[PDB]
Amino acid sequence: MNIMLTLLTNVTLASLLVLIAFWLPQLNAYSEKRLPFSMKFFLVAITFLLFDLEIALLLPLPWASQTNNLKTMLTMALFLLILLAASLAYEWTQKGLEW
Amino acid sequence: AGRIASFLKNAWAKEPVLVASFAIGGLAIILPSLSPYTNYAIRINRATPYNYPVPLRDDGNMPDVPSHPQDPQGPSLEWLKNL
Amino acid sequence: MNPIIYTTLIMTVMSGTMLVMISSHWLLIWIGFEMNLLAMIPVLMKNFNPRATEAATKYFLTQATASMMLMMAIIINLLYSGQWTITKMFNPVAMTMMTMALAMKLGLSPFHFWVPEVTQGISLQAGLLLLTWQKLAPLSVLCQISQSINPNLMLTMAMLSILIGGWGGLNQTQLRKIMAYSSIAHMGWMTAVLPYNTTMTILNLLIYITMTLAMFMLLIHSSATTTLSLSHTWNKMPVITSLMMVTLLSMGGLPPLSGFMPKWMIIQEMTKNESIIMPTLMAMTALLNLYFYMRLAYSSSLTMFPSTNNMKMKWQFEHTKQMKLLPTMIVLSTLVLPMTPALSSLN
Amino acid sequence: MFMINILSLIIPILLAVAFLTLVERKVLGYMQLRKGPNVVGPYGLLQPIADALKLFTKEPLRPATSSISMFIIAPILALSLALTMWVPLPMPYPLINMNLGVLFMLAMSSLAVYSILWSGWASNSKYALIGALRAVAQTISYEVTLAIILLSVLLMNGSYTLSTLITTQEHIWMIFTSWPLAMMWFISTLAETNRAPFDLTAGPFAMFFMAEYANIIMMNAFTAILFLGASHDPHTPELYTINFVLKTLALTITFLWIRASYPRFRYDQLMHLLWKSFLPLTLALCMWHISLPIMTASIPPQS
Amino acid sequence: GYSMFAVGIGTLLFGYWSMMKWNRERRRLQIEDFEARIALMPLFQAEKDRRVLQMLRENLEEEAIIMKDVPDWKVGESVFHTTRWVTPMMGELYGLRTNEEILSATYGFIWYT
Amino acid sequence: PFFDVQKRLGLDLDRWMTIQSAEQPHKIPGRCHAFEKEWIECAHGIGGIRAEKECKIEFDDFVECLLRQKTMKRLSAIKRQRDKLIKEGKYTPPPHHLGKEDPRP
Amino acid sequence: MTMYIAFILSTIFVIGFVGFSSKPSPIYGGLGLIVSGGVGCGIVLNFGGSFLGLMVFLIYLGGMLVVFGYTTAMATGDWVIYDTGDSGFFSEEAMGIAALYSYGTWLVIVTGWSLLIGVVVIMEITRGN
Amino acid sequence: PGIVELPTLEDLKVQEVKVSSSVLKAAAHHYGAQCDKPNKEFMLCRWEEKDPRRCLEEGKLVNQCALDFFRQIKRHCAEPFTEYWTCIDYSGLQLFRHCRKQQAKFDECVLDKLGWVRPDLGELSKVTKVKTDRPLPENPYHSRARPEPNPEAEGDLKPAKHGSRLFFWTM
Amino acid sequence: MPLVYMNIIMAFAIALAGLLMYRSHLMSSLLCLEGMMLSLFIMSTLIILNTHFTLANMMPIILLVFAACEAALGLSLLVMVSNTYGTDYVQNLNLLQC
Ligand SMILES: CCCCCCCCCCCCCCCCC[C@@H](O)O[C@H](CO[C@H](O)CCCCCCCCCCCCCCC)COP(=O)(O)OCC[N+](C)(C)C
Numbered sequence A: 001m002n003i004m005l006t007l008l009t010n011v012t013l014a015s016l017l018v019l020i021a022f023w024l025p026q027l028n029a030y031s032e033k034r035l036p037f038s039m040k041f042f043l044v045a046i047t048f049l050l051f052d053l054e055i056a057l058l059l060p061l062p063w064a065s066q067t068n069n070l071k072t073m074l075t076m077a078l079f080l081l082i083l084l085a086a087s088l089a090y091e092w093t094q095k096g097l098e099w
Numbered sequence B: 001a002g003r004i005a006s007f008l009k010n011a012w013a014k015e016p017v018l019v020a021s022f023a024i025g026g027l028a029i030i031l032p033s034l035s036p037y038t039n040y041a042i043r044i045n046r047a048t049p050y051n052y053p054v055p056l057r058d059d060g061n062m063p064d065v066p067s068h069p070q071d072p073q074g075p076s077l078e079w080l081k082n083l
Numbered sequence C: 001m002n003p004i005i006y007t008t009l010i011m012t013v014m015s016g017t018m019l020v021m022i023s024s025h026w027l028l029i030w031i032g033f034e035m036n037l038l039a040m041i042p043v044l045m046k047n048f049n050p051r052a053t054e055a056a057t058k059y060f061l062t063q064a065t066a067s068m069m070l071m072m073a074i075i076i077n078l079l080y081s082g083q084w085t086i087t088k089m090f091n092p093v094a095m096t097m098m099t100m101a102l103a104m105k106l107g108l109s110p111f112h113f114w115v116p117e118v119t120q121g122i123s124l125q126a127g128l129l130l131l132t133w134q135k136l137a138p139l140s141v142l143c144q145i146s147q148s149i150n151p152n153l154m155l156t157m158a159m160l161s162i163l164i165g166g167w168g169g170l171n172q173t174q175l176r177k178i179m180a181y182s183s184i185a186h187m188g189w190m191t192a193v194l195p196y197n198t199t200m201t202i203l204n205l206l207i208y209i210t211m212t213l214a215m216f217m218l219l220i221h222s223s224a225t226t227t228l229s230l231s232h233t234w235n236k237m238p239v240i241t242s243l244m245m246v247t248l249l250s251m252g253g254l255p256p257l258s259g260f261m262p263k264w265m266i267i268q269e270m271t272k273n274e275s276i277i278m279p280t281l282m283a284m285t286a287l288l289n290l291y292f293y294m295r296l297a298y299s300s301s302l303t304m305f306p307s308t309n310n311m312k313m314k315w316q317f318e319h320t321k322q323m324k325l326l327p328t329m330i331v332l333s334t335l336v337l338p339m340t341p342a343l344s345s346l347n
Numbered sequence D: 001m002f003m004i005n006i007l008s009l010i011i012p013i014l015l016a017v018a019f020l021t022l023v024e025r026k027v028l029g030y031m032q033l034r035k036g037p038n039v040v041g042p043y044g045l046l047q048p049i050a051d052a053l054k055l056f057t058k059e060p061l062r063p064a065t066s067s068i069s070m071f072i073i074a075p076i077l078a079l080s081l082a083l084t085m086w087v088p089l090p091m092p093y094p095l096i097n098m099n100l101g102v103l104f105m106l107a108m109s110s111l112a113v114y115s116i117l118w119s120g121w122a123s124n125s126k127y128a129l130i131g132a133l134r135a136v137a138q139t140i141s142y143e144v145t146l147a148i149i150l151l152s153v154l155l156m157n158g159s160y161t162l163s164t165l166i167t168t169q170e171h172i173w174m175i176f177t178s179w180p181l182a183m184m185w186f187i188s189t190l191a192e193t194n195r196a197p198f199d200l201t202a203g204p205f206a207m208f209f210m211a212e213y214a215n216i217i218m219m220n221a222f223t224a225i226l227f228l229g230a231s232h233d234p235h236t237p238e239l240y241t242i243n244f245v246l247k248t249l250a251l252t253i254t255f256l257w258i259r260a261s262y263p264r265f266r267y268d269q270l271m272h273l274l275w276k277s278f279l280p281l282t283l284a285l286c287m288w289h290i291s292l293p294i295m296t297a298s299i300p301p302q303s
Numbered sequence E: 001g002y003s004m005f006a007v008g009i010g011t012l013l014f015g016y017w018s019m020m021k022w023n024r025e026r027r028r029l030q031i032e033d034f035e036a037r038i039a040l041m042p043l044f045q046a047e048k049d050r051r052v053l054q055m056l057r058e059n060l061e062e063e064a065i066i067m068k069d070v071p072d073w074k075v076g077e078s079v080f081h082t083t084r085w086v087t088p089m090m091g092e093l094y095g096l097r098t099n100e101e102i103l104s105a106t107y108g109f110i111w112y113t
Numbered sequence F: 001p002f003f004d005v006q007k008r009l010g011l012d013l014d015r016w017m018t019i020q021s022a023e024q025p026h027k028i029p030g031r032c033h034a035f036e037k038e039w040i041e042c043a044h045g046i047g048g049i050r051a052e053k054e055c056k057i058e059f060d061d062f063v064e065c066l067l068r069q070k071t072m073k074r075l076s077a078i079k080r081q082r083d084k085l086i087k088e089g090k091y092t093p094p095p096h097h098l099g100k101e102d103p104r105p
Numbered sequence G: 001m002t003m004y005i006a007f008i009l010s011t012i013f014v015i016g017f018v019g020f021s022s023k024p025s026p027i028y029g030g031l032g033l034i035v036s037g038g039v040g041c042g043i044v045l046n047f048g049g050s051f052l053g054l055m056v057f058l059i060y061l062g063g064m065l066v067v068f069g070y071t072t073a074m075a076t077g078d079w080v081i082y083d084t085g086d087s088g089f090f091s092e093e094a095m096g097i098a099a100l101y102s103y104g105t106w107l108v109i110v111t112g113w114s115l116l117i118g119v120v121v122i123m124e125i126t127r128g129n
Numbered sequence H: 001p002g003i004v005e006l007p008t009l010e011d012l013k014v015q016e017v018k019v020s021s022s023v024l025k026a027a028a029h030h031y032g033a034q035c036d037k038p039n040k041e042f043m044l045c046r047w048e049e050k051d052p053r054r055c056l057e058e059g060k061l062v063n064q065c066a067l068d069f070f071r072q073i074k075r076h077c078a079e080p081f082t083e084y085w086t087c088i089d090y091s092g093l094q095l096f097r098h099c100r101k102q103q104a105k106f107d108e109c110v111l112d113k114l115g116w117v118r119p120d121l122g123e124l125s126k127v128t129k130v131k132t133d134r135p136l137p138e139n140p141y142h143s144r145a146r147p148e149p150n151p152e153a154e155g156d157l158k159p160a161k162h163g164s165r166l167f168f169w170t171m
Numbered sequence I: 001m002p003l004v005y006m007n008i009i010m011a012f013a014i015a016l017a018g019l020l021m022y023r024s025h026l027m028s029s030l031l032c033l034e035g036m037m038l039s040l041f042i043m044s045t046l047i048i049l050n051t052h053f054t055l056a057n058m059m060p061i062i063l064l065v066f067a068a069c070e071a072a073l074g075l076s077l078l079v080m081v082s083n084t085y086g087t088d089y090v091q092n093l094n095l096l097q098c
């Protein structure tokens, strides 16, 4: 209720200000007179996406540290980070991060 | 030995970021297996009561189970306090 | 590609299939399917050409739609009973969603349209992999939940698959499309006995995999993808054409060849359940598969087609690379009928 | 009286942006051995008002063939996100108290690229689209390391609650526990807002400008709360408010200083900077900050 | 060169030690809060049971009043075969009550920020 | 088909996640945990056919707890009859259900 | 009742799906899917799934609809089923999500292997030649 | 299937503890130290019976004991307690650390007046035993009788009679 | 099964039908799979939260991840097809036929 109302107020103020900005100078009359598709940008977007997926898994790490199984949790967190590093290394050594 | 030293000296020049990152990651992997405070962290996590401790029905054969928290028998947290 | 990357992708495909086969949680089965699909695409695109890219994108679209349908079935089954274990479904709607997803993954009619095009687009080794290894996981899942399936729907799709394979193979000159339609017909034969006996399903699967491996390795050895290209093999390797003719006779279900073992057994099983009309129609329709196998045999080994002059140069060279298991595959696909009772091993 | 609180949060932020324009001009001028605007107003104080009035009166040049819907929506989304990301922040008491406030801020930042994408696509020009693609690629690339650094730092806070950061830093600042992560975070926040040396790119133009400067102030305040923990006494929150505002102002002036001090990167050079220097160190320090509380038996409380 | 790295490592170690002490103190304080909650729990459980039972009885009385004209209705009839007590559903307690407190019991914790 | 590697090796790769009543973290209890436990204990080792035909009571209760369809039907019937009576005017809600009661802790 | 806010949210979800299912001008379909994702996030958050709703809204929207838009630009009854008790001094969703490392070792292993294989597969597919 | 039995409104009437959560948190440690026995009786009965309708008298007992505890507080040191709770009530998180001095004054007053020692860290979270004379419920889940298991046949294997007996095969 | 579940199910059905239409623009096909997975995530999250099944709180995220990985591959495929034709039209993929 509070968050929805705050969002509505923010959007309403932004809309009001943009429309008044777009219509204040409209009252007075004036004169009123390709293909390339480079492959590297798609690859950086996909790398960001793959990395983003890895980011979600860790997200729970702050809570994962209270389990009484600290050894297993530490091992799996380090495994996830090592595999993220391995993805970065593989894309590095295969000329995936070049321009 | 000598070749490893040459490789490390050649990498420490012109690639210091990678050397630092690999050293820090290797330490993060190795050191936890040797620290004596990891078991202390496990014990601290065990001592955090999230749930109500459900009492057990007394049957006349439970000497190690306290009848009151003030009783000497039962787990203590003096190691936690001294930490 | 790099041989290391190729081996990694092949083992990832096998590990996905294995994950599907050994798990008891529906989420893990879905994950195994996802892993298999993810690692399968570069194998189909190992040799780069527009046709292979088209085949891979069609295969991906089909398999991803099937995976989404399968996850929908899993979630509905969880909704009507908070269970994650692969067992009887407990929901009529969920079972249908699951059956259609697995039929789309297998290529059963009326979800067969992708198989001929994907097989034609990809190379011969990719086609061997696609038509042999990619049927294990969906069929294993079907076997695990066979007590849930509606027999009407499964039998309808099985008969439709047999009819479609038989009719579609009659119109083909390309060898890969012939293999695809043959695989569709054999899948139809396999899924018609799931409601009654999963052991017969597994026996049919094993026999079909053996024959398909033999036929694909023979087609790779004599590097032909069309009828007329295969018609030149007698002028270099007549023994290969003879072995191919015997294998084609086996694939048509003629006794005393190995290919007679499944249908016979399946028919026999279906008779124990007071099902008479359906096996009769299945055999009559398998006569079509036999017809186009026989046409291939006529064009390949039973008659001598004209050759070209450059073939003489090919007379001076021998294959550098060989398949170790090709003789064993041929023998197992032609001469194992006397060992039929060994099916009690619950293969 | 929640609406009054919302207005008292929103209006002062826009006024602060308006006068941050003047502050930046005057700071750059005095760093360049000259004066800034000192004529419009007693000390240049009327300059932002004059700029706003001139911009709001000048003709808006709509491309006359561009997508009207997105051409209006992009500044709306920019302003909405810039004003929304102030809600989560605790100064000391937050307007809205969120359990996962940090995650909410990250999600808003992730959305912020849609305005760039839509404004670039609407302009109906190949060159503008190329520039927008550059900007989007840089923004997503650097938000990766922003997220990883953020979770590595929060592994010492105990949760995603922004108020708990005040409790975590009651004795010492988080800058001393992890300065390298703070350095990389500062550079990534520079890159995220497209500020120099990473600045490779009527009404709606002013709207975008306001959104960008609001994000600048917001990011600096977030850094101040995250790494320079001000002491908070529950019976006098004005001390915390003043201290936090001073630290935010110092960080904003540091952005101005960095703008006035350095040349700018190439696109490939900043891509390489990130993907080959920050991400490896960020992953290594993420492993280190996962392991450290367990090694030292210093795991934060909440679970 | 060496001095700058030494300064960085030294301040890192100082921060690590300080936060070790502070985080252990925070763990002890959290354990104290949890102990207070544990001590207070039985009274809250008794009040919760008694409140739920009162709401159920009031709903039963209103159902007895309302359902007097329905032919095949049985007042207070369970839908489970088991005689075991089942935790009441949220619609069972606030079904006949006013909208404001229904929205309260449903979304008060979710919407409270 | 199903190769039960976990049972042969005693691994427990994914069985921890299959049912509601299997050792949740912090001993958190599932809403339908009591119903599922009874259904499982009824049907253990009996086999699928006999479980489906003989443990129908427990599964029906478990399903009801999970979806609460019959409770919805009963509550809707009560509300609809109350609405009919209040539209006719021969029934009046008590102060408890109008928010005029005395709340208890 | 607030006229069944969950129901109207689900209705807006269905309307948005109808909106982008016609597939007009794939940028417009993408924007319709973005609106649908925001509405679904609102549904999950209003239900009580704060972390999962924010995961939708961050990962889904800010990463992958963003990548879809990037690639496209490069080219040419409620309130009733709910509970009665409380959770304690923690959120059950966070603990269950948090439990994957302690409980879900197998899930972590298979997911990480799948993601590494996915990186390799993407690079190999886009290699060209 | 059956009628759900509920206690009457008179059965649920009890002299209620009408103090706020700040007062309760201020008193919680000594309350747990002093009023422990009825509380453990109630909670053991509550996890054993799994039924609110079977635990009402123990709830009345815990309410009475809490009322007695607060009457003792009121009689001997009302002022020290009031100052301490004022501090707890002010804080939004109700932290114990914020007002240590108030707590110390309260602790001294109770010990002299009632000889009460505040429980240490790790004591109120102990699992203790309860001497109760209430019988243990023999079927708390109200389960039915488990269905009879399958026969579980046993014997000594012999070769299949006349082999597989599959069509024309003699083995 | 209340009205919210049926709304999410019909949303999934609408997305599936839209995918099966194929007017043009394979990007729209990917978008339809994407809406399908989003509906799956929403309904699985609702089911798991309602029943308080604590552990399966993992599986929505996992689902997302895996589906998202799938999306990446699809995009790659789309891109490569465009590299052959200059457009992602569905009707250009008719080289292979039954
Ligand atoms: C034995 C057969 C070996 C050959 C076959 C290998 C098959 C492929 C390899 C992957 C399978 C590895 C098996 C691990 C299964 C996990 C379950 C088991 O190991 O126990 C876990 C132990 O986890 C340990 O951390 C094992 C660590 C192993 C994972 C790290 C590296 C794994 C890499 C394997 C392949 C990944 C990609 C390739 C990398 C090169 C659980 O620990 P615990 O907490 O007590 O129990 C939880 C239940 N509680 C909550 C009630 C207490």
Ligand SMILES: CCCCCCCCCCCCCCCCC[C@@H](O)O[C@H](CO[C@H](O)CCCCCCCCCCCCCCC)COP(=O)(O)OCC[N+](C)(C)C
Residues within 6 Å of the ligand: C199, C202, C203, C206, C207, C210, C332, C333, C336, C339, C340, C341, C342, C343, C345, C346, C347, F001, F002, F003, F004
């Ligand atoms: C056409 C010829 C096909 C031949 C097949 C390939 C031959 C090479 C195989 C190499 C040796 C295989 C043996 C495997 C070693 C261990 C076996 C163990 O792991 O599996 C057991 C069982 O192993 C297999 O069942 C036995 C395989 C034997 C196949 C032969 C029968 C084929 C029909 C007769 C045709 C003639 C073939 C003989 C000539 C070579 C237990 O299985 P179980 O976990 O409990 O349940 C899974 C099966 N269910 C689901 C159906 C119940």
Ligand SMILES: CCCCCCCC/C=C\CCCCCCCC(=O)OC[C@H](COP(=O)(O)OCCN)OC(=O)CCCCCCC/C=C\CCCCCCCC
Residues within 6 Å of the ligand: B014, B015, B016, B017, B020, B024, B027, D180, D181, D182, D183, D184, D186, D187, D197, D223, D227, D258, D262, D273, D277, D278, D281, D288, E009, E012
């Ligand atoms: C809130 C606090 C803010 C702190 C930062 C304030 C900024 C001060 C003003 C300067 C910033 C101006 C911004 C301009 C951008 C500058 C970015 C930059 O150039 O960094 C690049 C730079 C190097 O790149 P290149 O020189 O181009 O060569 C690499 C290829 N061979 O990248 C980096 O080095 C990043 C490193 C960040 C700091 C990390 C250093 C830590 C190393 C040792 C730490 C050890 C701790 C481990 C645990 C200890 C256990 C024993």
Ligand SMILES: CCCCCCCC/C=C\CCCCCCCC(=O)O[C@H](COC(=O)CCCCCCC/C=C/CCCCCCCC)COP(=O)(O)OCCN
Residues within 6 Å of the ligand: A082, A085, A086, A088, A089, A090, A092, A093, B008, B011, B015, B018, B019, B020, B021, B022, B023, B024, B025, B026, B029, D276, D279, D280, D281, D283, D284
């Ligand atoms: C066991 C710990 C593992 C986890 C820690 C790692 C986490 C994150 C770090 C890894 C990220 C991915 C790394 C990918 C490696 C690729 C490097 C590379 O290819 O760069 C080479 C050059 O870099 C190299 O030389 C390869 C690595 C060099 C060695 C780096 C450090 C290795 C280990 C050193 C310390 C080991 C442990 C401590 C020893 C010191 C004493 C304590 C070429 O550079 P370009 O930019 O492409 O072009 C420049 C030429 N024009």
